[PDB]
Each structure stands twice: as C-alpha cells, then as structure tokens.
Design a protein around this motif. Structure first.
Motif, PDB file in Angstrom:
ATOM      1  N   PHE A  70       0.875  -1.309   0.004  1.00 33.57           N
ATOM      2  CA  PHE A  70      -0.133  -0.047  -0.027  1.00 33.57           C
ATOM      3  C   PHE A  70       0.770   1.251  -0.064  1.00 33.57           C
ATOM      4  O   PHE A  70       0.403   2.203  -0.853  1.00 33.57           O
ATOM      5  N   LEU A  71       1.813   1.380   0.911  1.00 37.04           N
ATOM      6  CA  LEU A  71       2.464   2.507   1.308  1.00 37.04           C
ATOM      7  C   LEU A  71       3.478   2.678  -0.246  1.00 37.04           C
ATOM      8  O   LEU A  71       3.527   3.932  -0.614  1.00 37.04           O
ATOM      9  N   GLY A  72       4.101   1.543  -0.866  1.00 32.88           N
ATOM     10  CA  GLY A  72       4.561   1.792  -2.073  1.00 32.88           C
ATOM     11  C   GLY A  72       3.840   2.416  -3.374  1.00 32.88           C
ATOM     12  O   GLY A  72       4.027   3.108  -3.900  1.00 32.88           O
ATOM     13  N   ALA A  73       2.637   1.932  -3.165  1.00 39.14           N
ATOM     14  CA  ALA A  73       1.312   2.375  -4.082  1.00 39.14           C
ATOM     15  C   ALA A  73       1.328   3.759  -3.898  1.00 39.14           C
ATOM     16  O   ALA A  73       1.036   4.693  -4.704  1.00 39.14           O
ATOM     17  N   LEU A  74       1.009   4.277  -2.559  1.00 39.21           N
ATOM     18  CA  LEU A  74       1.147   5.644  -2.372  1.00 39.21           C
ATOM     19  C   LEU A  74       2.133   6.459  -2.853  1.00 39.21           C
ATOM     20  O   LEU A  74       1.865   7.652  -3.266  1.00 39.21           O
ATOM     21  N   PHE A  75       3.284   6.295  -2.518  1.00 32.89           N
ATOM     22  CA  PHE A  75       4.532   7.055  -2.879  1.00 32.89           C
ATOM     23  C   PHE A  75       4.468   6.959  -4.551  1.00 32.89           C
ATOM     24  O   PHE A  75       4.915   7.712  -5.028  1.00 32.89           O
ATOM     25  N   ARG A  76       4.172   5.815  -5.109  1.00 35.02           N
ATOM     26  CA  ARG A  76       4.212   5.653  -6.729  1.00 35.02           C
ATOM     27  C   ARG A  76       3.021   6.697  -7.237  1.00 35.02           C
ATOM     28  O   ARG A  76       3.338   7.364  -8.159  1.00 35.02           O
ATOM     29  N   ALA A  77       1.877   6.452  -6.550  1.00 35.86           N
ATOM     30  CA  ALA A  77       0.816   7.758  -7.091  1.00 35.86           C
ATOM     31  C   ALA A  77       1.538   9.206  -6.696  1.00 35.86           C
ATOM     32  O   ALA A  77       1.088   9.778  -7.621  1.00 35.86           O
ATOM     33  N   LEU A  78       1.916   9.344  -5.701  1.00 31.41           N
ATOM     34  CA  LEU A  78       2.510  10.885  -5.341  1.00 31.41           C
ATOM     35  C   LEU A  78       3.372  11.142  -6.378  1.00 31.41           C
ATOM     36  O   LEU A  78       3.630  12.390  -6.786  1.00 31.41           O
ATOM     37  N   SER A  79       4.534  10.341  -6.725  1.00 35.63           N
ATOM     38  CA  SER A  79       5.382  10.466  -7.770  1.00 35.63           C
ATOM     39  C   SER A  79       4.616  10.818  -9.229  1.00 35.63           C
ATOM     40  O   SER A  79       5.069  11.744  -9.866  1.00 35.63           O
ATOM     41  N   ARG A  80       3.767   9.980  -9.580  1.00 33.08           N
ATOM     42  CA  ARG A  80       2.937  10.113 -10.943  1.00 33.08           C
ATOM     43  C   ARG A  80       2.181  11.343 -10.902  1.00 33.08           C
ATOM     44  O   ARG A  80       2.067  12.004 -11.820  1.00 33.08           O
ATOM     45  N   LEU A  81       1.980  11.889  -9.807  1.00 31.54           N
ATOM     46  CA  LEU A  81       1.167  13.251  -9.605  1.00 31.54           C
ATOM     47  C   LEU A  81       2.093  14.336  -9.781  1.00 31.54           C
ATOM     48  O   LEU A  81       2.175  15.063 -10.424  1.00 31.54           O
ATOM     49  N   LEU A  82       3.083  14.312  -8.685  1.00 37.29           N
ATOM     50  CA  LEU A  82       3.882  15.588  -8.384  1.00 37.29           C
ATOM     51  C   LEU A  82       4.796  15.736  -9.565  1.00 37.29           C
ATOM     52  O   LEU A  82       5.462  16.715  -9.881  1.00 37.29           O
TER      53      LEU A  82
END
Lengths: 13, 13, 13, 13, 13, 13, 13, 13, 13, 13, 13, 13, 13, 13, 13, 13, 13, 13, 13, 13, 13, 13, 13, 13, 13, 13, 13, 13, 13, 13, 13, 13, 13, 13, 13, 13, 13, 13, 13, 13, 13, 13, 13, 13, 13, 13, 13, 13, 13, 13, 13, 13, 13, 13, 13, 13, 13, 13, 13, 13, 13, 13, 13, 13, 13, 13, 13, 13, 13, 13, 13, 13, 13, 13, 13, 13, 13, 13, 13, 13, 13, 13, 13, 13, 13, 13, 13, 13, 13, 13, 13, 13, 13, 13, 13, 13, 13, 13, 13, 13, 13, 13
Positions: free
Chosen positions: BN_1-13
C-alpha cells in the motif's frame, strides 16, 4: 458571519 | 483598492 | 479610527 | 456581554 | 490610562 | 469579589 | 511595590 | 490564615 | 505605580 | 526636554 | 548615574 | 529582599 | 569584579 | 547551601 | 487614549 | 509643522 | 579550569 | 555517589 | 480610513 | 505638486 | 543626568 | 563658542 | 586631555 | 565598578 | 521643543 | 542673516 | 601598551 | 580564572 | 508646508 | 531674481 | 558668534 | 578699507 | 601677527 | 581644551 | 574520548 | 548488567 | 621646530 | 600612552 | 539679503 | 561707476 | 603565534 | 579532553 | 596689520 | 616721495 | 475554490 | 574707496 | 595737470 | 489596480 | 503581466 | 516623454 | 638693506 | 618660529 | 630612519 | 607578539 | 508637472 | 533664446 | 590540511 | 564508530 | 531675467 | 556703440 | 653660501 | 631626522 | 562527489 | 535497509 | 527528478 | 500500500 | 492540482 | 465513505 | 505538476 | 534566453 | 623583497 | 599549516 | 513578457 | 541606434 | 654627484 | 630594503 | 524620443 | 552647419 | 541529478 | 569559457 | 602564474 | 575532493 | 539662433 | 565689408 | 547565450 | 575593429 | 639603460 | 613571479 | 583561459 | 611591440 | 553603428 | 582631405 | 562644410 | 590671386 | 590593428 | 617623408 | 624596443 | 650627424 | 648612466 | 673645447 | 658640489 | 681674469 466581518472591515479600512 | 480587496475576499469566503 | 474599529467589531460579535 | 466589553474597550482606547 | 483600563474592566465583570 | 479585585489592582497599578 | 501588591492581595482574600 | 500567609510573604519579599 | 516609575525616571534622566 | 517627555508620559499612563 | 538608577529602582520596588 | 538585591547591585555597579 | 558580584549574590540569598 | 554554592563559584571564577 | 497621547506628543515636540 | 503633523495624526486615530 | 569547576561542584554536593 | 560521579567527570573532561 | 490619512497628509505637506 | 501627488494616491487606495 | 553630561563636556571642550 | 554651544544644548535637554 | 575626558566620564557614571 | 574601569582607562590612555 | 532648539541655535550663531 | 535664517526655520517647524 | 591594557583589564575583572 | 585568562592574553599579545 | 518653507526662504534670500 | 525663483518654485511644489 | 569672528578678524587685519 | 570691509561683512551676517 | 591671529582665534572658540 | 590648543599653536608659530 | 566517557560511566554504576 | 551494557556501548561507539 | 610642535602636542593630549 | 607616542615621535622626527 | 550684501559692497567700493 | 554697478546689480538680484 | 595562543588556551582550560 | 583538543588544534594550525 | 606692514615698508624704503 | 607714497597707501588700507 | 481565489486576485491586482 | 585711492594719488603726485 | 587728471578719474570711478 | 496607479502617476508627472 | 501571472497560477492550481 | 514612459509601463503591467 | 628688510619682516610677523 | 626663520634668513643674506 | 621609526613603534606597543 | 611583528618589519624595511 | 516646472523656469530665466 | 530653449525642452518632456 | 584536521579530530574522539 | 565516521569524512573531503 | 541683466549693463556702460 | 551692443545682445537672448 | 643656508635651515627645523 | 636630512644635503650641495 | 559522500555514509551505517 | 536507502539516494542524486 | 525520487522511495519501502 | 501511495504521489507531482 | 491530489488520494484510500 | 469524503473535498477545494 | 508550473512560467516570462 | 532557462529547468525537475 | 616579507610573516605566525 | 601557507605564497610570488 | 518590455522601451527611446 | 540596441536585446532575452 | 646624492639618501633612510 | 633600493638606484644612475 | 530631442535642438540652434 | 550636424546626429541615434 | 543540472546550465549559458 | 567552467564543475560534483 | 597559484593552493588544502 | 576542485579550476583558469 | 546672433553682429558692426 | 563678412558667416553656419 | 549576446553586440556596434 | 574585438571576445567566452 | 633599470628592479624585488 | 614579470618587461622594453 | 584571452588580444591589437 | 607585449604577458600568466 | 557615425561626420565636414 | 580622413577612420573602426 | 567656408571666404575676399 | 588661393585651398581640403 | 591605423595615416598624409 | 615616417612607425608598433 | 625605435628614427632622419 | 646622434642615443638607452 | 650619456655626447660633438 | 666641456661635465655629475 | 662645478668651469675657460 | 672670476664665484657660493 465571516463575510459580514470582511465586508465591515472593508467598509472601515 | 484595499477596500475592494477586502470586499472581494468577503464575497469569496 | 481605532475606536471605530473596536466599536464595529463589537457591533459584529 | 462581549459586545459590551468591546464597546467599553473602544470608548477607552 | 492603565488604571482606567482595569477599573472599566472591573465595572464590566 | 472579582470586581473588587480588579478595582484594587487598578488603584494599585 | 511588590510588597504593597501582596499586602493588598492579602487584605483582599 | 491565607491572608496571614500573604502578609508574611509581602513583609518578606 | 507605573506613573511613579516614570516620574522617578524623568527626575533621574 | 527628555525629563518633560518622561513626566508627560507618566501623567498619561 | 547607573548606581543612582539602580538605587531609585530599588526604592521603587 | 528585592530592594536589598537592587541596593547591593547599585552599590556594586 | 565578577567574584565580588557572585559573593554579594551569595551573601544575599 | 546555596550561599556556599555561590561563594565557591565566586572563589572559582 | 491614543489621541490624547499623540496630542501630548504634539504639544511637546 | 511637526506639532501640526502629530496633532492631525491624533485627530485621525 | 573546567576540571576544577566540576571538582569543586563535586565537593559541594 | 554523586560526588564520585562529578569527580570522575572532572578527571575525564 | 487610509484615504483619509493620505488626504490629511496631503493637506498638511 | 507633492500635495496633489498624495491626494491622488489617497483617491487611489 | 544628561544635562550634567553635556555641562561637563562643555566645561571640558 | 563651542563651550557655550554645548552648555546651551545641556540647558535645552 | 583624553585622560581628563575619560576621568570626567568616570566621575559622571 | 564602572567608574573604576573608566578611571583605569584614563590612567592608561 | 524643536522650535526652542532652533531659536537657541539662532541666538547663538 | 544666518541668525534670521535659523529663527525663521524655527518659527516654521 | 596593549599588554598593559589587557593586564589592567585582568586586575579589574 | 577570568583574571588568569586576561593575564595570559596580555603576556601573549 | 513645503510651499511655506520655500516662500520663507524666498523672503529671506 | 533669486527671491522670485524661490517664490515660483514654492508656487509650483 | 560668526559676527564676533568677523569683527575680531576686522580689528586684526 | 579692509577692516571696514570685514566689519561690514560681520554686521551683515 | 600670525601668533596674534591664532591667539585671537583661541580666545574666540 | 580647544582654546588651549590654539594658544599653544600661537605660542609656537 | 566518547568510549572513555561511557567506560568510566560503566565502572561508576 | 548495567555496567556490562555501558561497557559494550563504549566498545561499540 | 617640528620636534617642539609634536612635543607640545603630546604635553597637551 | 598617547603622550608617550607623540613624545617618541617628536624625539624621532 | 543678497541685495543688502551687494548694496553694502557698493557703498563700500 | 563701480558703486553704481554693484548697486544696480543688487537692485536686479 | 597562533599555535602558542591555542596552546596557552589549552593549558588554561 | 578539552585541553587535548586545543593542544591538537594548536599543533595543527 | 596690513597698515603696519606698509608703514614698515615706507619707513624702510 | 616713495616713503610718503607707501605711508599714504598704508593709511588708506 | 483556490482557482477562484487566484482569478479574483488577478482580476483585482 | 577707489575714489579715495585715486584722490590720494592725485594729492600725492 | 597730472593731479587734476587723477582727481577727475576718481570723480568718474 | 497597478495599471491605474501607473496611469495616475503618468498623468501627474 | 501581473494579472496574467496570477491567472495562469489559478489555472494551474 | 516621462508621462508617455509611465503610461507605456502601465499598459504593460 | 636686504638683511634689514628681512629682519623688519621678521619683527612684524 | 616664523620670526626665528626670517631672522636667520636676514642674518644669512 | 624608517627602521628606527618602526622599532620605536614596536617598543611602544 | 605585536612588538615582535613590528621589530621584524623594522628589521626588514 | 515637469513640463510646468520647465515652463516656469523658461518664463523666469 | 534661453527661454525658448527651456520652453521647447518643457514641451518635449 | 582539511583531511588532516578531520583525521586528528577522529583520533581525538 | 564515530572515529570511523570522521576518518571516512577525512578520506573523502 | 537675463535680458534685464544685459539691458541694465547696456544702460550702465 | 557699446551700450547698443549690450542692448542688442539682450534683445537676442 | 648654499651649504650654510641648508645647514641653518637644518638647525632651525 | 629632518635636521639630519638637511645637514646631509648641506654637506652634499 | 555527493554520490560518493552518500555511498560512504551508507557503507558506514 | 538504511544502508540500502542511502545507496539508492546516492545512485539518484 | 522529483518524480524519480518519490518512485525510488516507493520501490524502497 | 505505502509503495502504491508513493508511486501515486510521484506520478502526480 | 490540489483537486487532482485529493482525488488521487481518495482513489487510493 | 472515506473515499467519498475526499472526493467531495477535492470537488470543493 | 512542477514541470507544468515551470513550463507555464517559461511560456509567460 | 530566460524562457529557455525556465523550460530546461522544467524538463529537469 | 616581497618573498622575504611573506616568509618572515610565515615564520612569525 | 598557516606558516606553510605563507611559505608557499612567498615561494610563489 | 520581458521581450515585450524591451520592445516597448525600444519603441519609446 | 539606441532603439536598435534595445530591440536586439529584447530579441535576445 | 647624482649617485652620491642617492647613496646619501639611502644611508639616511 | 628601501636602503638597498636607493643604493641600487645610485649605482645605476 | 532622443531623436526628437536632437531634432528640436537642431531646429533651435 | 551646426543645425545640420545636430539633425544628422538625431537621424543616427 | 546535480551533474545533469550543471551540464544543462553549461549547455545554456 | 563559462560553459567549460560549469561543465567541469558538473563532472566534479 | 594564476594556474600555479591555484595548483599550489590545492596541494596545500 | 577540495584538492581536485582547485586542481580543476587551476587547469581551467 | 547662431545665425541670428551673427546677423545681429553684422548689422551692428 | 566687415558687416558683409559677418552676414555671410551667419548664412554659412 | 553569452556568446550570442556578444556576437549580437558586435554585429550592432 | 570594435566589431572584431567583440566578436573575438564572444568566441572566447 | 631602461632595460638595466627594470632588470635591477626585478633582482631587487 | 614578480621578478620574472619585471625581467620579461626589461627584456622587452 | 587567461593566456588565451591575452593571446587573442595580442593577435587583435 | 604592443602585440609582443601582450603575447609575453599571456605567456607569463 | 560607429562606422556609420564617422561616415556621417565625414560627409558633413 | 578632412572628409577622406574621417571616412578612412570609419572604414578602420 | 569646410570647403563651403573657404569658398565663401574666397568669394568675399 | 588671394581669392584663387582660398578657392584652391578649399578644393584641396 | 594599430599598425593598420598608422599605415592608413601614412597612406593618407 | 612624412608618409614614410608614419609607415615605419606602423612597421615598428 | 626603444633602441629599435631610435635606430629607425636615425635611419629615417 | 643627426642620424649618428640618434643611433648613438639608441645604443645608449 | 648620466655620465655615460654626457661622455657619448662629448665624443659625438 | 666643446667636447672637453661635456666630458668635464660628465666626470662632474 | 656647486663649488666644484664652478671650479671645474674656471679651470676650463 | 675669467678663470679667476669663476674661481672666486665658486669660493663664494
């Protein structure tokens, strides 16, 4: 209320 | 100016 | 000025 | 009460 | 001034 | 009581 | 001053 | 008693 | 008290 | 001058 | 001077 | 006590 | 000087 | 004790 | 109060 | 001049 | 110096 | 004990 | 208020 | 000039 | 004090 | 001259 | 001169 | 103390 | 005050 | 001349 | 000179 | 201590 | 004010 | 001339 | 002062 | 002549 | 001459 | 001081 | 150093 | 035990 | 001459 | 010190 | 003033 | 001539 | 020099 | 320790 | 002075 | 003649 | 909302 | 002045 | 003649 | 607003 | 410019 | 020119 | 002659 | 000094 | 010369 | 140190 | 304004 | 000429 | 240098 | 450990 | 002004 | 002639 | 002669 | 020094 | 560099 | 893990 | 860059 | 989950 | 942006 | 629910 | 997002 | 240039 | 020279 | 170190 | 924007 | 020229 | 000659 | 050094 | 603008 | 000529 | 990354 | 040059 | 030269 | 690293 | 203008 | 002739 | 970029 | 020439 | 000559 | 270095 | 780099 | 010559 | 540009 | 001639 | 222009 | 002749 | 360049 | 001759 | 160089 | 002769 | 050098 | 003769 | 020196 | 005779 506050402040300043 | 600024802020919030 | 500011603030609250 | 407080403060300051 | 401030604050409370 | 306290504080300070 | 303040507080309480 | 305590504290400080 | 302080300071300076 | 300034400030506060 | 200032401050407090 | 403190400090400085 | 200051402070407290 | 502390500190510094 | 302060300062300066 | 400036500022505030 | 300070502090406590 | 602690600290520092 | 301030300053200067 | 400058600045703000 | 300072400076210079 | 200037300045302040 | 200046300043403070 | 400092400085300079 | 200063300076120079 | 200049400047300020 | 200055400052503090 | 510091600094400089 | 200053300077020079 | 120059400059500013 | 200076210079030259 | 010139210049300034 | 000039200048200042 | 300086200069030159 | 500090503290406790 | 812990911490850090 | 000038200047300062 | 400096400079120059 | 200066110079020369 | 020249120049300026 | 300064500072502390 | 630090720094610098 | 100079020159030539 | 000329020139200046 | 805020600020400023 | 100069020259030559 | 010439030149200038 | 400010400033200067 | 800057910033956020 | 400059700067910003 | 001239000029200055 | 200079020049020339 | 100057300056400081 | 500096500079220059 | 200034200067000069 | 120059310069700026 | 500084600091701690 | 850290930092920097 | 100056010079010369 | 010259030059400038 | 001149100037300064 | 300079110059020239 | 620094820090921890 | 983190950060930065 | 940083941080955790 | 969170944040920012 | 951030954060949770 | 909350917050802000 | 921000800023500036 | 700078910075981050 | 100066300065510090 | 720096600088310049 | 600014300034100057 | 300079500078930035 | 002059000036300085 | 400079210059010229 | 200025100057001179 | 020079200079800049 | 930043900056500047 | 400087700095970091 | 200076500075640090 | 930096800068400059 | 000046001079001479 | 000369010279310039 | 700037400046000047 | 100078300076930087 | 002068100056520095 | 500079300058001039 | 600069400047001048 | 001078100066630096 | 300036001057003169 | 001189100078620069 | 001047002078003389 | 001379000189220049 | 300048001057004179 | 002189001077410089 | 200059001048004259 | 003079003068310098 | 110059001049003339 | 005169003058200087 | 010069001239003539 | 004259003039000067 807050809108009223800022309207009064505008009318004053 | 300043009065217009505060009034716009009021209508916004 | 300052007196008017505090008076308006009173009338608001 | 609070309005009275601020009115007294205005009348004073 | 300050004495008047505390006196008015007394008369308030 | 509290009013007396603030009156004494005013008379002092 | 401080002595007078504490003495007034004593007379009060 | 409490008044006596504050009186002694005033006399001290 | 404060008035006495400023009076003494004036008398000094 | 300075003494008068501080004395006036005393009578004010 | 400085000594007088501190002595006056002492007699005040 | 405090008056003694400031008197000693004046005597020193 | 400093030694005298601390010594006077000791005799005070 | 505290007086002894400050006396030792004075004697040191 | 503030108006009185500035009036006194004007009268002084 | 200066006195008039401060007096006008007083009547403003 | 520092060694003397801590040694004196030790002999105190 | 505490005196021994501070003596060791002095001997070290 | 601010407009009044600048008008008074203009009238003065 | 200067007075007109400050008056224009007043009407602006 | 300040008056004494300037008087001494006058007497010196 | 210079002495008179400083003396008058003293009497002023 | 300079020595007299500093000596007078000493007697002042 | 301060007077002693300035006296020593005068004696030196 | 300032007017008095400049009057004294005029009388002097 | 110079005295009149400074006096006029005084009456101005 | 400089050495004497620092030595006098030592004897002072 | 401090006196020793300034004495050593004097001896050095 | 500024106009008054320059008028006085004109009248003088 | 010079007086007229300063007078016109006043009338301008 | 300046008038005195020029008078002394006149009487000299 | 020269003395009269400087004297007139004195009375002028 | 020169000596008299400097002496007169001294008595002036 | 300044008078003494110019007197010494006169005596010298 | 740090190793010696912790080692001495160990032997202490 | 505690001594062993601190000894090991010393050996480590 | 020059030596006398500097010597007198020393005796002054 | 300063007197010694100028005396040495005189002796030299 | 300037006119007075030149008139005095005329009457002199 | 010369006097009339400076007089006319005064009347001009 | 610098080395001697730091060495003396070490021997002091 | 601190003495060793400053000795090493001296040996280095 | 100038008169004395020219009188001496007259007496000489 | 020449002496009389220079004498008259002195009497003039 | 925030987009509306910055759009209003743009329209204003 | 110049007229006096030329008149003196006339009466001489 | 020459005297009259210089006299007329004076009356001119 | 800023455009209005600079337009008014242009119209003025 | 500035308005366009804020508008672009709005469309971004 | 100046007015045109400020007006162009206005239309820009 | 020349020596007498310089000697007279000396006694003058 | 100057008189001595011119006397030496007279004696020499 | 220069060497003697710097050497004397050393002996001073 | 400083004395050594200036002595070395003297020995050099 | 600036145009008015230069027009007034033209009309004057 | 000069007036026309300044007038044209005004019409320019 | 820097490397030696950090290495000495390491061997110290 | 800390020694290893500073050794590595030295080796690096 | 300048024309008036040159006209006065014409009338005079 | 000369007067006419200066008058013509006036009418020009 | 010239040598005597410079020698006399030396003994003077 | 200066006397030595001029003596050497005399002995040379 | 930076990469090497962080890599060394990694191998350390 | 932490070592891996710093390795990855190094590889990145 | 930033995206790569967060993506690497994700892969790490 | 946390890895998915940071991946989504990267894809966003 | 902010809207996208919160929307992605929702889709994630 | 929570996803709905953040979606509504996004739609709002 | 950040890349979009800087692209928009580039397109603007 | 500036636009290219910001665009390159965008593609970087 | 310069090399010798810097070398001596090194030997000093 | 500092001595080495200045020695290298000397060897260079 | 900046290019537009400089183009407008070019068109103006 | 100047316009071309500013235009080229615009096309550059 | 010239060589002797410069050599004497050398031996002097 | 300076003496060496002037000696070399003497030897040269 | 500058071209207009120089054209006006040409037309004038 | 002069007019043509200034006109050509305008056409240049 | 940082290397890429500086490479891009080099390519640009 | 500048590009090479930044490129070398890149390859370094 | 400059390259040698920086290289020597490198070998130093 | 630092040595490498200065070596590269030397190679460059 | 210059042509007018020279034409007036022609008409006059 | 002369008038014609100046007239032609005007017609030239 | 900088090379482009200087090339454009060359092409212009 | 000048163009070649700036072009070569560009080619260098 | 000139070459020898510069060569000797080199050998000196 | 400096010696090399002056030697090269000698060899050139 | 600097050598290249001066070589190019030589080639050009 | 000049080219050779700059070339040699390059070869130096 | 400069070439055009000098060509225009050539054609004019 | 002169025109050819300025034209050749243009072709040079 | 110059040719026209000399042609006009020829035609006139 | 003279006219032809000036005409030839015109055609030459 | 300079050689080209002087060659053109040679060819032209 | 003159052309040859400038040509040779170019050939030199 | 200078020798070459004077040799060329000799060969030419 | 003249050539020989300049040649010998070159051989000298 | 100067002696060599005059000897060469003697040998020549 | 003349050669002998210059030779004697050389041997003198 | 001067005496020697005149003696040499004597022995020659 | 002439030789004796110059010899006597030497013995005088």
């Amino acid at each position: 209320f807050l809108g009223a506050l800022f309207r009064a402040l505008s009318r004053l300043l």
